Design a protein around this ligand. Structure first.
Ligand SMILES: *[C@@H]1O[C@H](CO)[C@@H](O)[C@H](O)[C@H]1NC(C)=O
Length: 497
């Protein structure tokens, strides 16, 4: 339906300008006969998920690279795509006038937007909060009689999540993660720095902590919200580093194991919330395969772990094949999920760069690498930030796909939002990654998937400056002659019968 309104802030590409009366959006999804494909194209030059169609022909006029769909080569099924409703994202969204809020929510959650079906939710304060708090701040309340939700949940987070879910087509899955416990459960009695739970797994501190998860799930369920899954702790390794500035809670891989086996696993299993899944790690892939070896070789722990959550931030330090591929080799039945799909992004640049094509490219390149290394799901960090990359009570280092200007009742959809959308919009939950063979060495990032109804989706990323002639073969349909322009991303979609 409505086109992108471009604006330049002096970076390599444009943002799309939205406000209370206008946002760029899509017509309800509509797909052509066998023999025809749809192509969605974004370019550095300014095109934004622009749709064209053409033929899938019986004869091959391409003399360059060929990608061949191999539907009989079948891999992981996809859980999905989303981001995080941090207090910072909620405050930024709620600083818009209500009709602008809806245009923002539709942008992410509607079929007329990009089809998000996962929301990550922090269990209390993190660095993207304006203040420190947990749900049980009164000391020595080991039965947690004074557990409650603040304004942050009941006023900002929960309403925005209800509104996301009304907007969404697909069922949305909720994922929760803790940053810190009550500080009276901690060896350092502080929200941050080097500090663990007091005592040992099995004790009163660890039982109380495990019970807090259940209290949180009960509280959200009073608000008629249920969780797909919880992670065992956000960035547990951060809590082992002295002076760590953000909310945290240290677990060694061994402590995580024992806490799971002794406390979190049995407590959740013993609650009415026993269908909620558990993801271990929620941290840098550099920590793999080790962390998974420690936790998952102990069957009293492993029986409670459904998946392994990873963060992207420090990916450049550790190859996908050594970490993700190696972990899959060893525990092929434990899913890999990107719970904090965020990098960012060069000590000599600002937090937020409006219209950065490069940061876009980094998102899609990273989703593609993940997909080729068995990852089933991706949750971006903050849904929305202000232009200084906040609020953050400690310090901003990261960009966001939507940047909200609260002085102008306007929001900016960054190139990152469209790189994401090239995946989230066209890869519904249950989609299976399938084979896609390059005929010769090339510079493109490419992946193929089959929808639950058997139709084909292919994304092609060109991170070079130069146009690449391309043919895509489907053995069941024919050849698709196309071109990958320099600095573009294409999503191709087609019926297979
Ligand atoms: C919102 O954006 C639309 C599209 O540019 C524009 O025509 C309208 O003037 C905007 N509203 C305000 C208050 O700027």
């Amino acid at each position: 339906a409505r086109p992108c309104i471009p604006k330049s802030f002096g970076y390599s590409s444009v943002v799309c300008v939205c406000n209370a009366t206008y946002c760029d959006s899509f017509d309800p999804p509509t797909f052509p006969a066998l023999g025809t494909f749809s192509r969605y194209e974004s370019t550095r030059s300014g095109r934004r998920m622009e749709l064209s169609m053409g033929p899938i022909q019986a004869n091959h006029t391409g003399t360059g690279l060929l990608l061949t769909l191999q539907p009989e080569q079948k891999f992981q099924k996809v859980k999905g795509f989303g981001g995080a409703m941090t207090d910072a994202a909620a405050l930024n969204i709620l600083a818009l006038s209500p009709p602008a809020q809806n245009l923002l929510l539709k942008s992410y959650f509607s079929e007329e937007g990009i089809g998000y079906n996962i929301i990550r939710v922090p269990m209390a304060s993190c660095d993207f909060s304006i203040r420190t708090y947990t749900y049980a701040d009164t000391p020595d309340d080991f039965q947690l009689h004074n557990f409650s939700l603040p304004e942050e949940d009941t006023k900002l987070k929960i309403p925005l999540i209800h509104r996301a879910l009304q907007l969404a087509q697909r069922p949305v899955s909720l994922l929760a993660s803790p940053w810190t416990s009550p500080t009276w459960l901690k060896t350092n009695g502080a929200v941050n720095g080097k500090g663990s739970l007091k005592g040992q797994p099995g004790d009163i501190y660890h039982q109380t902590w495990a019970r807090y998860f259940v209290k949180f799930l009960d509280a959200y369920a009073e608000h008629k919200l249920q969780f797909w899954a919880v992670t065992a702790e956000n960035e547990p390794s951060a809590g082992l580093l002295s002076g760590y500035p953000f909310q945290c809670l240290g677990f060694t891989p061994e402590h995580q194991r024992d806490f799971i086996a002794r406390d979190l696993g049995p407590t959740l299993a013993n609650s009415t919330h026993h269908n909620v899944r558990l993801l271990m790690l929620d941290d840098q892939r550099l920590l793999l395969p080790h962390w998974a070896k420690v936790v998952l070789t102990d069957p009293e722990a492993a029986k409670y772990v459904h998946g392994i959550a990873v963060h992207w931030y420090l990916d450049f330090l550790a190859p996908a094949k050594a970490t993700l591929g190696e972990t899959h080799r060893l525990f092929p039945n434990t899913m890999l999920f990107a719970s904090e799909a965020c990098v960012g992004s060069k000590f000599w640049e600002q937090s937020v760069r409006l219209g950065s094509w490069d940061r876009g490219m980094q998102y899609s390149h990273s989703i593609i690498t993940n997909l080729l290394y068995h990852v089933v799901g991706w949750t971006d960090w903050n849904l929305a930030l202000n232009p200084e990359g906040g609020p953050n009570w400690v310090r901003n280092f990261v960009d966001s796909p939507i940047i909200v200007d609260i002085t102008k009742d306007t929001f900016y959809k960054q190139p990152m939002f469209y790189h994401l959308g090239h995946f989230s919009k066209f890869i519904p939950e249950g989609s299976q990654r399938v084979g896609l063979v390059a005929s010769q060495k090339n510079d493109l990032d490419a992946v193929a998937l089959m929808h639950p109804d058997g139709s084909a989706v292919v994304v092609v990323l060109n991170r070079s400056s130069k146009d690449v002639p391309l043919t895509i073969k489907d053995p069941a349909v024919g050849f698709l002659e196309t071109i990958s322009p320099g600095y573009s991303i294409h999503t191709y979609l087609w019926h297979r019968q």
